[PDB]
Nucleic acid binder design. Sequence first.
RNA 1: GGAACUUUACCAGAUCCGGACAGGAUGAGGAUUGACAGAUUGAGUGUUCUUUCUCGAUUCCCUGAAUGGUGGUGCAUGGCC
Lengths: 91, 115, 59, 60, 54, 212
Amino acid sequence: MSTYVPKPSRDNVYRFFFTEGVIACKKDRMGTWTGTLGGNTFTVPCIQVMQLMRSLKSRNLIKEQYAWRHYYWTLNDEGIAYMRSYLHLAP
Amino acid sequence: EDAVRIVIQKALEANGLVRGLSEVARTLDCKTAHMCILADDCEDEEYKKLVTALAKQGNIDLINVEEREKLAQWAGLVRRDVAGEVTKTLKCSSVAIRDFGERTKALDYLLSQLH
Amino acid sequence: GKIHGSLARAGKVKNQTPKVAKQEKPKQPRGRALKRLKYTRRFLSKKVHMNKQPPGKAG
Amino acid sequence: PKKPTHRHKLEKMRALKYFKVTENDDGSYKVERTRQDCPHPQCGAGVYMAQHKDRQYHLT
Amino acid sequence: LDQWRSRQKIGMGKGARCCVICSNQKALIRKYELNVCRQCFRENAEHIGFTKLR
Amino acid sequence: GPLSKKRMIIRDGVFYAELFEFLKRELAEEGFSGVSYHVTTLRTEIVIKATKTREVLGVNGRRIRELTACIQQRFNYKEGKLQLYVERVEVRGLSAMAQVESLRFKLLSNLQVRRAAMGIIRYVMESGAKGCEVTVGGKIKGQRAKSMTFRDGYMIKSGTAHKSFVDSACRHCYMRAGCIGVKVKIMLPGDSTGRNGPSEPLPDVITVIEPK
RNA sequence: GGAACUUUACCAGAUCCGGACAGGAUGAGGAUUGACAGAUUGAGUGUUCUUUCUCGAUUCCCUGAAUGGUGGUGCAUGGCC
Ligand SMILES: [Mg+2]
Ligand SMILES: [Mg+2]
């Protein structure tokens, strides 16, 4: 699809990624990604989750390891402190 | 104008702010935005005040502040350094809110404000 | 053919060398004070590699 | 034979899309609109149609 | 325009299939619906459980 | 509907094969040494074997917490279904998978190739191993690649019994000039309980017993 | 390696960025996304030109870079054979 990520998706992915701490996303560039805030209703495409995390890792906020066909991204100590400012939360 | 500063950074926390020409002009036609602010000074389109029509016709609250450039310096719509101050400021003339709230919005009901 | 060099190819590499210029580099001391500069670095400031190079494409 | 342009979006010069006359607003009227919506496809709230020789536009 | 991967949307062919370890679509083992590439399987036969007895 | 028993042994093998690759990449500098997973109702166990249990666990379990939910979000487990543990290897000198990852770091920290490899074999053979063999292959000396092997003790290689007695692991070392591969083979001594090594003796050792 | 498309690496064209992140000039008084009808086109392909609405900071324009490649070198290598 498009790596042009809409703003209601980006904060919705970041709401999951601060809560669970990790996102595992398949390398399939025609398939979706599904995450859960209780409702399991994201249906974000996998093309956009790669673009969101490639912007994060270039700002050295996440730690990326890649298995067979899945990414695994984790927040850092600077990354959690950065993610709290975007979601405007108390420490 | 200083109590307007606190109520809009509570608005950018969630969710939910509309800024500018804008679809703010569209949501006041829908009357969905609960409260707005805009320029008091005259600018482009002679300060046409269609927002002053679209608020009161839709029974929406309206607040005027004189400085239309550097309207929301707290909201950070202008470039940062991040060492020093902000650079040359864009318009950000009219701001429509449908948001929280809960701290100084009780103070925003003073001066018998449009109701 | 058998021969691949010619008298017409004289000075081929020296003409196409990219012609870098030397940099500014203020003068070192001369004479007895240069021996003082040699001695202080190789003895007073502690195999001993006199020209160790930073890592390149060999590792 | 000739390279195409790689179109950028045109600026509307201080108006994306616009309302109607009598900006005095002396407690009698809301301002009228200058196009329609034809709703539920898909939103219809702030969706305003194009002129395009007065035809139509999104979509909805 | 989103004609973008319209041939890869329909999934009938040798391009729709893929090595699940090694991301290649050449010479994959589809017996027992295994879907691992030929070369990327011999590295992983012991962890799947296959051992060469004979 | 259910898959056949032939179709479920496949997906249970590809589960363990993928789980093994993820933890081999993550926990390389934590001294990772294997997985065993136990599945039942109400919970799926995963026990991780390591040499550095203060590091594969976080400060409050932070590292295994992230490492838990990476397995949960991938394999679509639900809350309560997936629990992970860390056990440590008791010896560290009989685990060929741990020693090769350390030998990977001895080269990547720009130490000498032969000094690093004999540091393994001294540490492996003092830890009760019957034998060890380290092979470093790559551009060791210069432009053209060499191969060196370093050896001590016993080493069984031709049997099919060497799967029971010899522990092996091969990793890659990404040098600045190229790629070096290291191999570490350790012949397991003893441990009739199966702590590290088989119960039965070697297939050709007869060991006649003495009469009373 | 029993290739109709895909596979695919080749040839004639056409899109898309999947050029992250920095630094600098446009920027909410709009950075930009997308598209109906026509013309363009192999294409009821908005690729583009006309037309005007949508998207609402995700982008775009320069500079520095980086990531992709079934590009090269198996006579720089690892691994396997
Ligand atoms: Mg089948
Ligand atoms: Mg624990």
